[PDB]
Write an enzyme that holds these catalytic residues in place. Sequence first.
Site, PDB file in Angstrom:
ATOM      1  N   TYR B 363       0.795  -1.220   0.000  1.00 57.99           N
ATOM      2  CA  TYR B 363       0.000   0.000   0.000  1.00 57.99           C
ATOM      3  C   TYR B 363       0.838   1.286   0.000  1.00 57.99           C
ATOM      4  O   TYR B 363       2.033   1.261   0.294  1.00 57.99           O
ATOM      5  CB  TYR B 363      -0.995  -0.047   1.148  1.00 57.99           C
ATOM      6  CG  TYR B 363      -2.128  -1.018   0.827  1.00 57.99           C
ATOM      7  CD1 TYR B 363      -1.923  -2.398   0.883  1.00 57.99           C
ATOM      8  CD2 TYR B 363      -3.365  -0.547   0.394  1.00 57.99           C
ATOM      9  CE1 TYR B 363      -2.950  -3.291   0.547  1.00 57.99           C
ATOM     10  CE2 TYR B 363      -4.384  -1.425   0.048  1.00 57.99           C
ATOM     11  CZ  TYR B 363      -4.164  -2.785   0.121  1.00 57.99           C
ATOM     12  OH  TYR B 363      -5.178  -3.635  -0.240  1.00 57.99           O
ATOM     13  N   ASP B 377       1.000 -12.724  -0.177  1.00 59.81           N
ATOM     14  CA  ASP B 377      -0.156 -13.607  -0.021  1.00 59.81           C
ATOM     15  C   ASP B 377       0.239 -15.065   0.053  1.00 59.81           C
ATOM     16  O   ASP B 377      -0.275 -15.802   0.906  1.00 59.81           O
ATOM     17  CB  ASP B 377      -1.162 -13.376  -1.144  1.00 59.81           C
ATOM     18  CG  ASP B 377      -1.642 -11.950  -1.200  1.00 59.81           C
ATOM     19  OD1 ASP B 377      -0.871 -11.085  -1.675  1.00 59.81           O
ATOM     20  OD2 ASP B 377      -2.760 -11.696  -0.750  1.00 59.81           O
ATOM     21  N   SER B 378       1.186 -15.485  -0.789  1.00 60.87           N
ATOM     22  CA  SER B 378       1.608 -16.879  -0.758  1.00 60.87           C
ATOM     23  C   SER B 378       2.602 -17.130   0.377  1.00 60.87           C
ATOM     24  O   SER B 378       2.397 -18.040   1.197  1.00 60.87           O
ATOM     25  CB  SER B 378       2.145 -17.344  -2.107  1.00 60.87           C
ATOM     26  OG  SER B 378       3.098 -16.424  -2.610  1.00 60.87           O
ATOM     27  N   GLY B 384      -2.105 -21.895  -1.332  1.00 61.64           N
ATOM     28  CA  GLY B 384      -2.646 -23.230  -1.528  1.00 61.64           C
ATOM     29  C   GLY B 384      -3.599 -23.657  -0.440  1.00 61.64           C
ATOM     30  O   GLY B 384      -4.711 -24.146  -0.698  1.00 61.64           O
ATOM     31  N   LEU B 386      -5.264 -21.729   1.398  1.00 62.16           N
ATOM     32  CA  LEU B 386      -6.421 -20.844   1.282  1.00 62.16           C
ATOM     33  C   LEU B 386      -7.129 -20.906  -0.081  1.00 62.16           C
ATOM     34  O   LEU B 386      -7.933 -20.009  -0.424  1.00 62.16           O
ATOM     35  CB  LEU B 386      -6.006 -19.423   1.643  1.00 62.16           C
ATOM     36  CG  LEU B 386      -5.576 -19.261   3.116  1.00 62.16           C
ATOM     37  CD1 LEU B 386      -4.980 -17.877   3.357  1.00 62.16           C
ATOM     38  CD2 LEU B 386      -6.746 -19.469   4.061  1.00 62.16           C
ATOM     39  N   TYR B 460      -9.138 -10.020  -0.552  1.00 58.82           N
ATOM     40  CA  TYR B 460      -9.006 -10.171  -2.007  1.00 58.82           C
ATOM     41  C   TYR B 460      -9.015 -11.650  -2.440  1.00 58.82           C
ATOM     42  O   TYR B 460      -8.555 -12.523  -1.696  1.00 58.82           O
ATOM     43  CB  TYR B 460      -7.722  -9.516  -2.511  1.00 58.82           C
ATOM     44  CG  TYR B 460      -7.794  -8.036  -2.887  1.00 58.82           C
ATOM     45  CD1 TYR B 460      -8.747  -7.554  -3.780  1.00 58.82           C
ATOM     46  CD2 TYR B 460      -6.860  -7.133  -2.396  1.00 58.82           C
ATOM     47  CE1 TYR B 460      -8.784  -6.214  -4.178  1.00 58.82           C
ATOM     48  CE2 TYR B 460      -6.894  -5.774  -2.784  1.00 58.82           C
ATOM     49  CZ  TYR B 460      -7.852  -5.324  -3.678  1.00 58.82           C
ATOM     50  OH  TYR B 460      -7.892  -4.003  -4.082  1.00 58.82           O
ATOM     51  N   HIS B 518      -2.598   1.207  -4.089  1.00 63.87           N
ATOM     52  CA  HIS B 518      -1.666   0.121  -3.837  1.00 63.87           C
ATOM     53  C   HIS B 518      -1.326  -0.547  -5.159  1.00 63.87           C
ATOM     54  O   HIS B 518      -1.825  -0.135  -6.185  1.00 63.87           O
ATOM     55  CB  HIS B 518      -2.317  -0.887  -2.906  1.00 63.87           C
ATOM     56  CG  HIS B 518      -3.612  -1.391  -3.430  1.00 63.87           C
ATOM     57  ND1 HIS B 518      -4.777  -0.644  -3.359  1.00 63.87           N
ATOM     58  CD2 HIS B 518      -3.919  -2.528  -4.090  1.00 63.87           C
ATOM     59  CE1 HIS B 518      -5.753  -1.321  -3.946  1.00 63.87           C
ATOM     60  NE2 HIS B 518      -5.257  -2.468  -4.389  1.00 63.87           N
ATOM     61  N   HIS B 520      -0.828  -4.485  -7.196  1.00 67.90           N
ATOM     62  CA  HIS B 520      -0.862  -5.949  -7.162  1.00 67.90           C
ATOM     63  C   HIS B 520       0.294  -6.423  -8.007  1.00 67.90           C
ATOM     64  O   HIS B 520       0.366  -6.090  -9.195  1.00 67.90           O
ATOM     65  CB  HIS B 520      -2.179  -6.504  -7.742  1.00 67.90           C
ATOM     66  CG  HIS B 520      -3.397  -6.101  -6.972  1.00 67.90           C
ATOM     67  ND1 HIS B 520      -3.954  -6.891  -5.994  1.00 67.90           N
ATOM     68  CD2 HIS B 520      -4.164  -4.986  -7.035  1.00 67.90           C
ATOM     69  CE1 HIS B 520      -5.018  -6.280  -5.494  1.00 67.90           C
ATOM     70  NE2 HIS B 520      -5.161  -5.123  -6.108  1.00 67.90           N
ATOM     71  N   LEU B 528      11.713 -23.073 -17.731  1.00 66.43           N
ATOM     72  CA  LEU B 528      11.647 -23.476 -19.132  1.00 66.43           C
ATOM     73  C   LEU B 528      12.920 -24.257 -19.465  1.00 66.43           C
ATOM     74  O   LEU B 528      13.982 -23.874 -19.012  1.00 66.43           O
ATOM     75  CB  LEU B 528      11.556 -22.257 -20.046  1.00 66.43           C
ATOM     76  CG  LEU B 528      10.345 -21.348 -19.797  1.00 66.43           C
ATOM     77  CD1 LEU B 528      10.380 -20.140 -20.713  1.00 66.43           C
ATOM     78  CD2 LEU B 528       9.068 -22.149 -19.968  1.00 66.43           C
ATOM     79  N   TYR B 661      19.322 -14.590  -5.462  1.00 66.93           N
ATOM     80  CA  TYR B 661      19.533 -15.578  -6.523  1.00 66.93           C
ATOM     81  C   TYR B 661      20.258 -15.020  -7.756  1.00 66.93           C
ATOM     82  O   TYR B 661      20.962 -15.765  -8.426  1.00 66.93           O
ATOM     83  CB  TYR B 661      18.228 -16.214  -7.029  1.00 66.93           C
ATOM     84  CG  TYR B 661      17.268 -16.736  -6.012  1.00 66.93           C
ATOM     85  CD1 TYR B 661      17.695 -17.249  -4.780  1.00 66.93           C
ATOM     86  CD2 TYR B 661      15.897 -16.756  -6.300  1.00 66.93           C
ATOM     87  CE1 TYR B 661      16.781 -17.749  -3.870  1.00 66.93           C
ATOM     88  CE2 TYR B 661      14.978 -17.244  -5.387  1.00 66.93           C
ATOM     89  CZ  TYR B 661      15.421 -17.729  -4.175  1.00 66.93           C
ATOM     90  OH  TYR B 661      14.501 -18.198  -3.272  1.00 66.93           O
ATOM     91  N   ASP B 664      25.049 -12.979  -8.094  1.00 67.32           N
ATOM     92  CA  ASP B 664      26.402 -13.355  -8.498  1.00 67.32           C
ATOM     93  C   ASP B 664      26.576 -13.404 -10.011  1.00 67.32           C
ATOM     94  O   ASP B 664      25.613 -13.612 -10.770  1.00 67.32           O
ATOM     95  CB  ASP B 664      26.819 -14.689  -7.863  1.00 67.32           C
ATOM     96  CG  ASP B 664      27.108 -14.565  -6.353  1.00 67.32           C
ATOM     97  OD1 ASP B 664      27.073 -13.438  -5.801  1.00 67.32           O
ATOM     98  OD2 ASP B 664      27.377 -15.612  -5.720  1.00 67.32           O
ATOM     99  N   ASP B 672      21.343 -24.439 -17.827  1.00 67.82           N
ATOM    100  CA  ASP B 672      19.970 -24.613 -17.347  1.00 67.82           C
ATOM    101  C   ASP B 672      19.502 -23.321 -16.692  1.00 67.82           C
ATOM    102  O   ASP B 672      19.971 -22.947 -15.615  1.00 67.82           O
ATOM    103  CB  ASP B 672      19.871 -25.794 -16.383  1.00 67.82           C
ATOM    104  CG  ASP B 672      18.422 -26.192 -16.089  1.00 67.82           C
ATOM    105  OD1 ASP B 672      17.492 -25.437 -16.507  1.00 67.82           O
ATOM    106  OD2 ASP B 672      18.210 -27.252 -15.462  1.00 67.82           O
ATOM    107  N   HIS B 683      -3.215   0.017  -8.663  1.00 70.82           N
ATOM    108  CA  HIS B 683      -4.646   0.045  -8.505  1.00 70.82           C
ATOM    109  C   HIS B 683      -5.059   1.373  -7.849  1.00 70.82           C
ATOM    110  O   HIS B 683      -4.936   1.531  -6.651  1.00 70.82           O
ATOM    111  CB  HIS B 683      -5.095  -1.172  -7.680  1.00 70.82           C
ATOM    112  CG  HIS B 683      -6.577  -1.299  -7.511  1.00 70.82           C
ATOM    113  ND1 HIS B 683      -7.155  -2.354  -6.819  1.00 70.82           N
ATOM    114  CD2 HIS B 683      -7.600  -0.543  -7.970  1.00 70.82           C
ATOM    115  CE1 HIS B 683      -8.468  -2.198  -6.826  1.00 70.82           C
ATOM    116  NE2 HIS B 683      -8.764  -1.110  -7.513  1.00 70.82           N
TER     117      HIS B 683
HETATM  118 CA   LIG Z   1      15.580 -24.588 -17.472  1.00 66.99          CA
HETATM  119 CU   LIG Z   2      -6.379  -3.656  -5.557  1.00 70.27          CU
END
Ligand SMILES: [Ca+2]
Ligand SMILES: [Cu+2]
Lengths: 720, 718
Positions: B363, B377-378, B384, B386, B460, B518, B520, B528, B661, B664, B672, B683
């Site tokens: 926000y 959220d996750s 999952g 929720l 939400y 705020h 999202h 891939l 991640y 470096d 890979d 929003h």
């Molecule tokens: Ca890959």
């Molecule tokens: Cu929103």
Amino acid sequence: HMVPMDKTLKEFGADVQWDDYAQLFTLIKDGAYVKVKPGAQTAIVNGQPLALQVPVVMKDNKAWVSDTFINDVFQSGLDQTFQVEKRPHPLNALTADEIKQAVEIVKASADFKPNTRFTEISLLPPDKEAVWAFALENKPVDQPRKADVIMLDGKHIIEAVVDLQNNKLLSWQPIKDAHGMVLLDDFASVQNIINNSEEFAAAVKKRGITDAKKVITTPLTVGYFDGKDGLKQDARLLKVISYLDVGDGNYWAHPIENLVAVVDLEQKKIVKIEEGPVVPVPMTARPFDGRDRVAPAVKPMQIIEPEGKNYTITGDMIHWRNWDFHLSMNSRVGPMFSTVTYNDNGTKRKVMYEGSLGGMIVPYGDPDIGWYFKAYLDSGDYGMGTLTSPIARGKDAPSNAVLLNETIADYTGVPMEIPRAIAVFERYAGPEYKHQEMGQPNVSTERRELVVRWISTVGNYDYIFDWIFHENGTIGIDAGATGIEAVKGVKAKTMHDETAKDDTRYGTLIDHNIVGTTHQHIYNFRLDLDVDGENNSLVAMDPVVKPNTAGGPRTSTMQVNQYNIGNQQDAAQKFDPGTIRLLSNPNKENRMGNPVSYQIIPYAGGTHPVAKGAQFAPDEWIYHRLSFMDKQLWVTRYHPGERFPEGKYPNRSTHDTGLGQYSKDNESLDNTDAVVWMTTGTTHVARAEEWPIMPTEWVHTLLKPWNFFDETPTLGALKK
Amino acid sequence: MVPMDKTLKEFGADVQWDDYAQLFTLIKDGAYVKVKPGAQTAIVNGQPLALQVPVVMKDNKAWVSDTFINDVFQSGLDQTFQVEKRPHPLNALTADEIKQAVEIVKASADFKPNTRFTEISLLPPDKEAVWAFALENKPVDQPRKADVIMLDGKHIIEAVVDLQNNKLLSWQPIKDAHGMVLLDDFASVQNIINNSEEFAAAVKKRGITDAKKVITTPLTVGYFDGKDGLKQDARLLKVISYLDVGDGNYWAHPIENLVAVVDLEQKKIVKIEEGPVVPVPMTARPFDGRDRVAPAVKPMQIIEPEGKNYTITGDMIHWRNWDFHLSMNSRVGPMFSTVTYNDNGTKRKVMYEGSLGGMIVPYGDPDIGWYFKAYLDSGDYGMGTLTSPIARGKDAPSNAVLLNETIADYTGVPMEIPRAIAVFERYAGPEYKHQEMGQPNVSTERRELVVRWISTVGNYDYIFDWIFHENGTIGIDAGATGIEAVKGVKAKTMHDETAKDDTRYGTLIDHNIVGTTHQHIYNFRLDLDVDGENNSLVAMDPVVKPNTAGGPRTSTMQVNQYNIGNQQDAAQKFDPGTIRLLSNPNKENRMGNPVSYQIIPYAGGTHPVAKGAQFAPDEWIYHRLSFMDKQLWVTRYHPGERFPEGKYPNRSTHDTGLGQYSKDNESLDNTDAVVWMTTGTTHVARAEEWPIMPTEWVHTLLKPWNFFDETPTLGALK
Ligand SMILES: [Ca+2]
Ligand SMILES: [Cu+2]
Ligand SMILES: [Ca+2]
Ligand SMILES: [Cu+2]
């Protein structure tokens, strides 16, 4: 007398399903969903019984019906989708009779000549105030029906106005320096002129072609280069690119590269042959029609509305949920959406007076002799309404669509009915809203969109336009592109060959000896929004990060810079999709005292890379001629004769007579009648997945109510 | 005999009666059944079925055998679900495996009473072995293992269990990690607030007569280097409060400028912050239709009367040229694995694993109730866990198949989520068309396979669609609906005295209610493997260059192409006018172009787009969550690098996710790679979104780019 049911219904365009277990036919066409059992004296049409005097007869596993069955069932009245219009709407397009009358009236002047053709015959815009008064108050329009009649007399354009009520010619005006659009007979003329050219047949023979009668021509407009192309400005010219017909149905796959003929259409002769290096014609068969492919095994899926549709079509007036609008067809730009209102608890609120395609362009990026001039102004130069592609039922639109026929004038002034010109369909579009409060019953409702779809094909490319009416007041406009790439014949078979790097400087190698030359697709929509009224203002809201001056731990806050855009030059701008652009009514507020507005989103996404402007240096003539290409949002003052972003007569135009002209003068956009123009475009770099036919690629635009309403618009009717 | 309508409705099937044809049509998931009263046979997905007992009519109600449902729906004539004889190695933990993992850790002397479980999930076998199972049917040689992450009061411990050998492999306390919010924390916060005399007194001062009508919502507090006054070792939540007025929508009645800080281990309020008094907005604002009548709508059905084009074998979905494995995780929800495209008989790798990485809703308001407000959220709540069960026919179309999924709850008990995921095929316009002038038309229909999942975190509701196109494209779309988080203010309209100050950080969307601005922000982790493991990141920038070929043009359209060889440069803003490819430099199409996928982190949306984070770069949220400010990231594959916000983001002091991640300088050349896409909206609210927000969408795309040799949907050659 009786006819074979299956064959007759298929001629008629109905889907026929037989269920052997139920001993039941299901027949579907447009708004009619029909159930009938062999031997039954009743059929069901949209859930209602219909008496049949002659039952469907089965005999040796073969159904027969009376020769009145089709009319008895489908035109019964139990399909309520179409209704008869009581008083004709003043924006109804010219009828066949009105077209024939306009053509008789101009033919009754001594100036008309037998080679004279008609580039456009269309209703003359009636007074806007009166049209809105008809739509909102049922006030009759007192002024007489008139047609604009635009003629091409050899190479000269003449604008005539005819009064249809009184059956007289009101004006006859030569338009100095204007060139006419390409007409249907020019395609045959170019092919004929090339077939008769000794010089052209010799040129073709030098490039490996043994049979000159297998050469297919395509006509292109030549543009304007202040004489660098070596082409006289007063002459009616087209350039002609050629391909070899190898019998695969796809001549587009066999370019004859670096051979261009310039044809003078008045003289009916080739006036110049431009010849570059010899590149062998790519010969391999590349059909796109499935002749060399296995047919898919696919299980059926049907979208069915067995009690009929939620929309009613009364003449050309579409009614659907809170929406009402008028839908008409124009030969240049196709569908026009007029007197669009939203019924807000009994009060029809203005949203849009007229919306349509403004115009479009597909300009190429290769400087070579076959390419440097190449730019399709699809609507302005070729007439997209005229080139409407009839909807392939169930494929180009879903199985639950209603397909409309539309009538325009052809180039000889004869009415032309386009079958299946426009599809109308309701579709499920995910949840309209949802909230699953923890430990409580769920709340979900389904979203429904009404789509009006129109397809036009100009040479190699096929364009799909969807006008999407959301139940909640949003309007989407999406443009799709499919068809066959315009390709360059090259010597490289793979990227490992010697010429590959030079061959692919201006596009990707997408087949052996075939390069998909890079280009843009640029669409512009003219949207005369009248946001709850005529008098509107353009408002900017830029979300910004500002230092926190309120105390506490945060260093920054999210705020908005809000300002009015009061003049046209400032309104002509790039669209940053992180900003908000509103067309607001400063005279009307919602319940919270916010001005009732629509948010204008010229870029809501797409599946190809986006064009941020024109991929041309600013000293290019095409850049100079077509300013609309380089900005995404324009707002101008309403004027009934300012309709086309490229200008009225863009063929060989020497300057910008469209949006560059309309937005030029410093006139106020404050609290006045505004017209919004959105340009959206892509930069198409090709790939092998797009050859020999391109899977449909889409771009999206949106118009969203912004404090136009007081609450969630789809909550439903208040029970208190 | 049992009554048909009652029995079938309890089974979850739709029942239609056609009096004209004297025909019942029965629909559930992939089964489309037709049956006439008195008939000795029925039709299931277009195939005949002998009945033991005909459907019988008594007093115009149908009765069926008590075995009818089994006989008809589990006949085998519905081929939508097939038996999995050799389980895929990425199959999620079963109910029995969850219980076993829990028993293994509970058997340790180190297991403390009242320990909770933040996550119990498969510890997946090595990637090479999994691909070899999917592509060559090679058995993975390893035992089933589970990662078991425990919260012992406030202390995080990671264990690993071997499920085949029924033994504990490791037990590792994680120094300084704070656990995510668990379900019992919601009730603890409400109870702790209900028993605070100080809080009741504070509430009384703000004009609330009945303190038992106060509804709490728990929020994580973030990290501000002590500037918030909060001790870093304590397990804390902040508590924002609303008034229940009986409209079903407490969200519409904020108690503004009152925040409690709760210590969950002490079980008490350790700080109350009190700002200016703003009367509670009181007007009823139900969203559930109790005060509304919907307009009548004619029916629409989408029917597949011969069944589906997809088959679901265990968790393996087969559809047209696509094969993939679908599993559920308690943190991030659905995971799409071992994704291949069958190119004229040869399965080609496209994606090893793709899922939601993580998301943030932060926000823009500096006030006491708002400055710290940022829903991960996750990571912080467990999306999952929720998951919101699909409302059949509304949240997904009537032709969907709805899957149940099993995860562990916070006490370690298996939890079956009904209708957790929808799978459905949809019409999506023409696949291609060409109407050559004067010739027969060529058109084919487009079909898309959508896998839809909905998760709700407080106010939400988020919808994620993974869209498989027949032509090789994969779309990932994220939708947001639900109830806005609102600020109580004094202004009723924009004409009132406080209106300008009241709306400095959001729109006035109702009387006394501001929808605080705020963002999202969603991030997708997409491993891939473009026709193989070893890939490179390639940029193609379309540019205008001067013409050097002669003739009248001054300029041309060309491309600047260059490789992006290290991670630091790969972390970038996405310009949608450019092309970014993950290419396989070892394999080419028929024209000698490297087989590639085009990565499009921004393919549009219906709210304004976030160009990055709407935060100054000295904000703590900005420092902690680098993933917010760039749209494309590419990293080297590592099975432990999964979350863009880091593994333990609650009160994190630095970025342990994508900031770490991608830090470096290691090579992305021919190796890979894992792609991460950040997409977000800014929003700014409007009245049309209150009391409930019509679903807004953002779109992303992965497109084959010279992966094939031609149009992929033309079909096989005769
Ligand atoms: Ca890959
Ligand atoms: Cu929103
Ligand atoms: Ca206007
Ligand atoms: Cu193109």
